[PDB]
Symmetry: D2
Subunit: 266 residues, 4 copies
């Protein structure tokens, strides 16, 4: 007799789980996640902002890197997200319990986060994580300000309905640097055409390619560094090979077109 | 010495609160709300669907009209919404407690409904109602089926971010009738330009005019009958003067353009 | 023809809405609410705690009093509640939006707060307010610490299922002062016996009288000052006539017994 | 270099996941879960009630057994729970999506269910499952009626704060059978004494032993059949060796006392 299968945890490449010390991107902005998952710490005179947390098991590591940067749990004011999947919003619930952080997200990301990634449009309950509540809902183009640093939401629906690019201007060498943190434009295993759970998926991705193309973008960062050709293990050269937002959008669209063609052929 | 003001309940025109008997729109579809607030009952071989409930005090009236139509509380399967303001989603929480009904809504409508209309983009906490949870989140263009009757969501963001037109095909006289239930395209007291809580408000309304224009639309109904020139008190002539979806969209756009011009002048 | 009634806002005595300047209770502890609604500010080296906010319209007043005390919105860390009715938790949602404050509450209070007081066991939807989410759920006897000040939850179910007394030790004149903030032990218009929504109501109130009787209680404060014979308008004599926790419990039990007898007679 | 550990799914004994055909307990009441996880189907003239669903992967199996019993997804009206851990409430979110079922639970169980078992008092995020919302909150002693069958909640806090025994009277052989579905009285790996997350844990378990002892209890069933000495694989003898509620309470208290002694020694 054959029992129902055991639950299976989603495993990821070791590099996604490999702790790294803080890597400075600009005067206020640091990568504090792992070798292969972005978690951006933005430090202001009025507390700190975290953009993404990576996987659920990264909470303690994030807190240790924050401490190394001089940010105590009380000092973390705000959490923003690229998208509410387990490998980017994984530790958000735990971070909220263990810090002063509140979450701002769009309605789509808030709904997905509140169900801990369950009933995903494409993944079903395959990739779940601890649910968290949003403290503020943002609209497309809306800004949120912490310690005078202004972050602008740019909705880029597709990878998830609530996928968002976040933009802000930091400084380096006395010069402004317009940083764009663009969400994933992957569609891993997705049914793209005629998907009853996402009927306008293709139109949304197309619009999102155009949105990403047009971001204020002196420097592009992505939830997976490899997407934008960052190499967080490469020290002084970490960002040397980084794509422009234009090239990232184009490469993602080319890949998407290929996937659409293969799906039609499939 | 001057105390803080007493809370003020939102009052509405008496007609919005004036009970009426069920008014048949098509073979399966009945208006069961008040003279001036739409609440559509769609009766299927597998239970009933309610589109909108009107104001919070209308729950019992709705249930009485459902009973008159042969729909017991157990038989009400689904609640859909035009938008999650007090004068359309008012009694939803109570209906869920008192019937078998589950709610399907988009993420924006779900978020607003779950906070009972509080922290509204334009109204603040001026117009609140009992919060309710959504049971199913729908995407733009997604269909939901009850007793073989298929309802399609058409997102028409503006009046609220989650404003939705619902379409379905009923029958009359052996002929199909493509019914369009289009949400409000009003912007009552709204700041339209440069609204920090809704930066792309104008672009969303413009897109929504185009969406409404293009709906499958043999018969248009609206949350306020007057918006589409229905007169639910007019018996056999209730729907005679009804606007097409095209004319409704055009009139709403003309009004919107006027409001934009007056705002610029203001 | 007779329309459904207009919604009616709950009105309260003017004194409940009458702003007052901060009134010091102990070295760290201030009354910052109105003449007749308690809102306790506890100021620590690590940010401030608010116990209750009063009615929904009191948010701005609370924030102004906090500013007068040197507590900026960022500095408000924690909100605790006596019970989640409109006249004590009214402004909590707004305070969370406008400050750094997170909410800790028991599961019963959290559920009631999340529905904005709707579907109340006794009031139905008569007394609703903007819903808010809890950030931390506490158990009976659990402590929560802010800036070294330790607050202990004592569950005293009855007035609401989640009614809580909060205790902490402050100082005055170099001496410890064990402060007890005991919730209401009223049952206004309640059906006490055989209430299908609260079958063990009487047993819970009885247990709660015993809990209140036994609190560490050098100084008793209550959500309505009059309950404990505080007079916040009386300056240096505000707390002179204050009841012990023992006397408060006894008077409340005597009143309850009377109500039970009258209900039996009714 | 050493990456953070991969997430680990909780595995269970194969028997907990071993599908079985429906096993009749009384005229209306069937075991439809697995060999070693209880899921009780109660069939009424007005739809069906499910008490527990077992593990997250059991949804489809439950639905298949319901179909075999003549209960279509539309016909499932109500889900009740012993406690909101993954091995009993696992499939509840999915069941709600796939059926007409609404959930009734106490505030503690509702809060835990809504966070999908995350931030557990004892397990932390070790044992999570898809979150679900409750549709009705019940108080201790409150009854809920479906198709004339009356279910009474008896709170028995300890295993979880919201642990509940459910009682109802079915029939067998023309005679009433008072069925008691008592929750777990285990404390697996729990810190019992001086637990900051559950300060009154011991007092709650003691009270719960007394509650279980005193249930109306012609037949005891438990979430794990072995707890009450049921053997669902034993056909006509499945319930022969079943403990009384009195013996179950006593054995659980004896085990608890042993655990307390070992903890003190530890
Ligand atoms: C596809 C996948 C498998 C396991 C864990 C996470 C994911 C995932 N969701 N979104 C992105 S980007 N992923 N890598
Ligand atoms: C005060 C509080 C309640 C719930 C969750 C988190 C917190 C909190 N605020 N600041 C810090 S550090 N916390 N842990
Ligand atoms: C503007 C207003 C006042 C009171 C009650 C409801 C409303 C309202 N919100 N959306 C629409 S359409 N309304 N009439
Ligand atoms: C069973 C149930 C639980 C919570 C809320 C509503 C209901 C319900 N289902 N069918 C009917 S009629 N109900 N009242
Ligand atoms: C009874 C009542 C009427 C209006 C507003 C609030 C209340 C109330 N709930 N709990 C307490 S204490 N109140 N005064
Ligand atoms: C950052 C944030 C997000 C949502 C709600 C409130 C807040 C906040 N934290 N500190 C202050 S002051 N806020 N307004
Ligand atoms: C202890 C444990 C491990 C894995 C899955 C479930 C559980 C559990 N929680 N409550 C009960 S009873 N369990 N068996
Ligand atoms: C209508 C509905 C919406 C959300 C979730 C479930 C359902 C539902 N009701 N009856 C059946 S069968 N459903 N799947
Ligand atoms: Zn993803
Ligand atoms: Zn990813
Ligand atoms: Zn509206
Ligand atoms: Zn309206
Ligand atoms: Zn009250
Ligand atoms: Zn009060
Ligand atoms: Zn358990
Ligand atoms: Zn178990």
């Amino acid at each position: 007799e054959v029992p129902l299968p055991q639950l299976r945890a989603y495993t990821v490449d070791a590099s996604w789980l490999q702790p790294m010390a803080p890597l400075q991107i600009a005067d206020h902005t640091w990568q504090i996640g792992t070798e292969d998952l972005t978690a951006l710490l933005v430090q202001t005179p009025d507390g700190a902002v975290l953009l993404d947390g990576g996987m659920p098991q990264m909470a303690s590591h994030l807190l240790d890197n924050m401490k190394a940067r001089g940010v105590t749990p009380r000092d973390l004011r705000l959490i923003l997200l690229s998208h509410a999947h387990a490998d980017h919003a994984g530790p958000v619930a735990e971070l909220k319990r263990r810090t002063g952080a509140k979450v701002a997200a769009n309605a789509e990301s808030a709904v997905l986060l509140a169900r801990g990634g369950s009933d995903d449009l494409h993944f079903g309950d395959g990739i779940t994580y601890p649910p968290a509540n949003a403290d503020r809902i943002v609209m497309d183009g809306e800004v949120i300000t912490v310690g005078g640093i202004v972050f602008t939401a740019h909705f880029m629906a597709g990878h998830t309905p609530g996928s968002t690019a976040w933009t802000w201007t930091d400084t380096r060498n006395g010069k402004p640097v317009r940083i764009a943190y663009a969400d994933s434009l992957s569609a891993p295993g997705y049914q793209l055409q005629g998907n009853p759970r996402y009927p306008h998926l293709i139109e949304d991705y197309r619009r999102s390619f155009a949105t990403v193309r047009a971001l204020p973008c002196d420097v592009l960062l992505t939830p997976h560094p490899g997407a934008s050709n960052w190499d967080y293990a490469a020290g002084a050269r970490a960002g040397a090979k980084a794509l422009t937002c234009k090239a990232y959008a184009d490469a993602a669209e080319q890949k998407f077109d290929g996937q659409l063609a293969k799906e039609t052929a499939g």
